[PDB]
Design a protein around this nucleic acid. Structure first.
Ligand SMILES: [K+]
Ligand SMILES: [K+]
Ligand SMILES: [K+]
Ligand SMILES: [K+]
Ligand SMILES: [K+]
Ligand SMILES: [K+]
Ligand SMILES: [K+]
Ligand SMILES: [K+]
Ligand SMILES: [K+]
Ligand SMILES: [K+]
Ligand SMILES: [K+]
Ligand SMILES: [K+]
Ligand SMILES: [K+]
Ligand SMILES: [K+]
Ligand SMILES: [K+]
Ligand SMILES: [K+]
Ligand SMILES: [K+]
Ligand SMILES: [K+]
Ligand SMILES: [K+]
Ligand SMILES: [K+]
Ligand SMILES: [K+]
Ligand SMILES: [K+]
Ligand SMILES: [K+]
Ligand SMILES: [K+]
Ligand SMILES: [K+]
Ligand SMILES: [K+]
Ligand SMILES: [K+]
Ligand SMILES: [K+]
Ligand SMILES: [K+]
Ligand SMILES: [K+]
Ligand SMILES: [K+]
Ligand SMILES: [K+]
Ligand SMILES: [Mg+2]
Ligand SMILES: [Mg+2]
Ligand SMILES: [Mg+2]
Ligand SMILES: [Mg+2]
Ligand SMILES: [Mg+2]
Ligand SMILES: [Mg+2]
Ligand SMILES: [Mg+2]
Ligand SMILES: [Mg+2]
Ligand SMILES: [Mg+2]
Ligand SMILES: [Mg+2]
Ligand SMILES: [Mg+2]
Ligand SMILES: [Mg+2]
Ligand SMILES: [Mg+2]
Ligand SMILES: [Mg+2]
Ligand SMILES: [Mg+2]
Ligand SMILES: [Mg+2]
Ligand SMILES: [Mg+2]
Ligand SMILES: [Mg+2]
Ligand SMILES: [Mg+2]
Ligand SMILES: [Mg+2]
Ligand SMILES: [Mg+2]
Ligand SMILES: [Mg+2]
Ligand SMILES: [Mg+2]
Lengths: 102, 229
RNA sequence: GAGCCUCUAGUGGAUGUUUUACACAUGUAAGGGAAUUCGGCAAAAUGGAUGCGUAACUUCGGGAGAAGUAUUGGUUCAAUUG
RNA sequence: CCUCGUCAUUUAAAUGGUGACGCGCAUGAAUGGAAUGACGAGAUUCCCACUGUCCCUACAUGUAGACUAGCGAACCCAUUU
RNA sequence: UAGAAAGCGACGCGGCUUUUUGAUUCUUCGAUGUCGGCUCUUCCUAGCAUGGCCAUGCAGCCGUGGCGAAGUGUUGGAUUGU
RNA sequence: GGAGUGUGGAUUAGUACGAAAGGAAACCCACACGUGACCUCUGGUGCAGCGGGUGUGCGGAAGUGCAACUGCCAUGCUACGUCUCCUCAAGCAUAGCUGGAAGCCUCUAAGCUAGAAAUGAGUCCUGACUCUGGAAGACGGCCGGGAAGACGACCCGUAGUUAACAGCGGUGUUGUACGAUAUGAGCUUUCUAUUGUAGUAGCGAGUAUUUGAGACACUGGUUGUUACCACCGUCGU
RNA sequence: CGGAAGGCUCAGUAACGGGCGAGUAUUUAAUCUCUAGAACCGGACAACCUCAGGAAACAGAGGGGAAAACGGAGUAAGAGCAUGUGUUAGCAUGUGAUGAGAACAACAGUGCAGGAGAGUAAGAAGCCAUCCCAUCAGUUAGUAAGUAGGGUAAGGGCCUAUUUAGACGUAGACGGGUACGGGGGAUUAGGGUUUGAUUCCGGAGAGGGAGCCUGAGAGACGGCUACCAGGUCCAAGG
């Protein structure tokens, strides 16, 4: 069981520890400890705090969502699937055409 | 939660409900992730699936390039997914969308089966379908006409394809026979009109070029007469 | 010839023990901010230089650093006191 | 004196402060009377900033203090308490 | 509202208390530190709240007069040395 | 010696009661003040530990003194945190039962019943005089520690899962060591051979790699090495 | 291809807001006159087909398929720069970034690429006239100018760097108050005094401020985006 994920550090927070801070902007935000809340107030950018999970991902020391570079699975050619023309007949027509073309 | 499965070798579709444990094993994934069918059902070993997209329960779409578990508002143009502009060019509008990361928000996930292997998934494997339209363009038609890298009159190929339809489909019949037509190949009406443009340029040249000499016969001192304003 | 740090020249003893409470010299403090007390007593806050901008009243000299605001380290350059 | 005088303003609340009023127990003109500026470690009231003064106390440092070696007094005392 | 006595009780009469201020000068003038606040403990009852009851001009709600009872409570501020 | 005290909400109920308007009565749950403890969490504190900068010292860098400033933070201590708090017996005032005096009546003259946050016990803290047991040796000092502490006293250990140093596992705190190497807003044009070619550089804040590095602690886990078997007194048979 | 016109109002503005001349330092889809075009290849988007989300408003997957729509190839053409020669077109020579293109129907026609000149519309400019208060006398520092560059369709402190101290005022500067401006209206012997929101022309706005895509042309609101002031529907999520 977890309480959530810390906003600044990126660290997952155990059940029964940490605190929520609610701003007048109406947002609610979860912090691991007083240490990282204070660093937010003082406008220290998280990417510079080298032990944070955020910083390590940004540097590429840890594999993260940005590294993945996924692409759509490529398929192959089919026996010409076209309206009316039954799949099997084209398997035959294509051959017959290839013959005549030679 | 629904799951919507497409099988692109067959052209077939099926929708199923998931159970809790199946659902909870999908959480954390994103579009263009892959998994093995064994994680959704018992059996289905070695069937590889890819995640395509889906919908929030509020109805907002999942977007392929917004890597978060949250809703945002984005300014969207024509050609962006999630927006369909119509009555003014250059229109752009701000709409709510959801990030790609899967969680309890989602009502439906779309999935493609890459290969059914030895398995017999109902409805996906039991049917094979084709396309909806026919290649109008000549070279697209030719490839389908089975030929390659040889020269024909379109009539030959139209004859081949029509005869094959009569034979292979109907074994004789007036059914089928969709209204096949060909683009990007010169018909006789085009041969004439394309000859005529050659006639135009050849005369317009000679006529223009004549008058120059005809002028110079009369006016040797063209420049000295004209220029003194 | 301030405070802080060094060169020349000069300097030191009632013994051991980690040592409660109450003291005397000092530090720091969530949320609140004089509710404390005869009384803000004590403490905190402000602080140098450069620029912008400065009221009532006045014996016309002053008030005046009024008030109120912004800037300031290291490096590598231009320009010569800006 | 009566007296914490009456009316207005300052506070949630004013035996306080400032502004008015005046038959003033017992104000008043070099026994000097009245209105201001600049300057007071002078007396008094309010506001902003600031805070362990307070709600309500907690923790930590140095030096004494407890215990130990060497050295070594005084105030006071009818005393059986 | 009838009616002495639910509640009151004129004109008169008998007591108790030492928490007010007097009255007196017994003890201390070769010295018993004098007002108020702060802090902290214990006692008294002539009972304000909280518990059990009786009367009522006690319908109910809210009260008023009395009885046994001293276990637990009785605050934060403004002006002023009070 | 002594300890729990009070308030509110919901339900009875818009009910009884009243012409109407209005308008009551257990059990359960939340809280405040008081009492006794406790650090798992959250605040606070910074002695041990890791980092940063200013002025000036040890020729430079590295390691660092003094004046003092500053970010984080083990163990511990603490409240602004968390847990805690009822049951018998005899009976007051009163209201009653039976019942004479006094053929009737009557709570009272004998006798009996219900009865208060009050009284006396138990559960809670202190612990007088006692009681039951083992054995010819017992006990104290000296040596080393703490969960205990002003000093005594208390809880413990002394040839062993004993202590201390190292590996190798484990659990934390700080934030990425020294040295190399590469880059860097810009600024610059030096040298050797030798006539003309070739060789051919300097100065620089910072940033990235090697490197969740390096430092520091604790381990009731496991291996190696090293040290320790005494002595003095009192009472008894 | 049009939705940038017409319709409504007079808040703001003492000013390129108004009258008269002139045609540039500029850009202009349509339309006119003259002239004027040998080009190959590839995917998608919407609708269609199969699933299928959401309270609604509004959207998803997967697979075909067109153009005179779109992107690439060659190729004509071709900005700027430099020197000759003709102000100035044009021509010569060197160097070159860039880089395209529509046909179709016969009721007998309708379109579309390039140039040069017109035509329409804007942008910027010249001269002259413009209300009250002195109980408002000094105002300004991109302010006044110069050199060089960036920017724009284009001249220019329009903006920026270094130099020069200018510019405007009792013939009323600067500040404040007030005002849509004319053609015109009412009164009138003559000289005057008063008014003009209101058929024509030109300007500005779309609750108040600010930014913007598309296009030949908007800083557009019967287009988009954010704040401030107000509202409407919900199944509470929009
Ligand atoms: K801290
Ligand atoms: K359309
Ligand atoms: K000196
Ligand atoms: K000095
Ligand atoms: K005060
Ligand atoms: K006072
Ligand atoms: K004092
Ligand atoms: K004067
Ligand atoms: K002053
Ligand atoms: K008063
Ligand atoms: K007053
Ligand atoms: K007198
Ligand atoms: K006098
Ligand atoms: K006199
Ligand atoms: K003084
Ligand atoms: K200490
Ligand atoms: K000592
Ligand atoms: K005396
Ligand atoms: K005194
Ligand atoms: K009572
Ligand atoms: K009491
Ligand atoms: K704790
Ligand atoms: K702590
Ligand atoms: K030193
Ligand atoms: K802490
Ligand atoms: K009884
Ligand atoms: K007792
Ligand atoms: K014995
Ligand atoms: K010991
Ligand atoms: K390093
Ligand atoms: K590192
Ligand atoms: K819903
Ligand atoms: Mg504080
Ligand atoms: Mg604070
Ligand atoms: Mg007080
Ligand atoms: Mg002081
Ligand atoms: Mg006072
Ligand atoms: Mg007065
Ligand atoms: Mg006098
Ligand atoms: Mg007395
Ligand atoms: Mg004395
Ligand atoms: Mg005496
Ligand atoms: Mg005494
Ligand atoms: Mg009594
Ligand atoms: Mg320390
Ligand atoms: Mg051990
Ligand atoms: Mg118009
Ligand atoms: Mg109208
Ligand atoms: Mg107006
Ligand atoms: Mg093309
Ligand atoms: Mg300048
Ligand atoms: Mg008008
Ligand atoms: Mg407009
Ligand atoms: Mg607009
Ligand atoms: Mg409009």
């Amino acid at each position: 069981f977890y309480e959530g994920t810390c906003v600044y550090s990126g660290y997952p927070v155990p059940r029964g520890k940490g605190t929520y801070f609610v701003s007048l902007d109406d947002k609610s935000s979860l912090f691991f400890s007083s240490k990282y809340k204070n660093f937010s107030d003082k406008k220290i950018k998280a990417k510079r705090v080298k032990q944070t999970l955020m910083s390590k991902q940004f540097c590429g020391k840890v594999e993260s969502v940005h590294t993945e570079k996924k692409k759509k699975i490529v398929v192959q050619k089919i026996v010409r699937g076209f309206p009316a023309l039954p799949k099997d007949a084209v398997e035959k027509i294509r051959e017959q055409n290839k013959d005549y073309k030679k | 939660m629904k799951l919507n499965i497409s099988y692109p070798t067959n052209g077939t579709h099926k929708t199923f409900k998931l159970d809790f444990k199946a659902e909870q094993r999908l959480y954390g994934k994103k579009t263009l992730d892959t998994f093995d069918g064994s994680i959704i059902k018992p059996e289905w070993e070695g069937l590889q699936f890819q995640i395509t997209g889906g919908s929030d329960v509020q109805g907002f779409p999942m977007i392929k390039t917004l890597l978060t578990d949250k809703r945002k508002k984005l300014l969207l143009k024509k050609g962006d997914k999630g927006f369909k502009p119509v009555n003014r060019k250059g229109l752009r509008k701000r709409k709510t969308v959801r990030g790609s990361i899967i969680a309890s928000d989602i009502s439906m996930v779309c999935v493609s089966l890459i290969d059914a292997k030895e398995v017999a998934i109902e409805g996906l494997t039991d049917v094979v379908v084709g396309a909806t339209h026919w290649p109008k363009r000549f070279n697209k038609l030719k490839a389908k006409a089975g030929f390659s890298e040889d020269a024909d009159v379109t009539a030959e190929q139209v004859l081949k394809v029509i005869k094959d339809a009569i034979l292979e489909v109907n074994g004789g019949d007036i059914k089928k026979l969709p209204k096949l037509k060909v683009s990007r190949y010169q018909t006789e009406k085009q041969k004439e009109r394309k000859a005529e443009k050659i006639k135009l340029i050849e005369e317009r040249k000679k006529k223009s070029e004549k008058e120059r000499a005809d002028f110079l016969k009369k006016y040797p001192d063209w420049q000295k007469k004209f220029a003194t304003k």
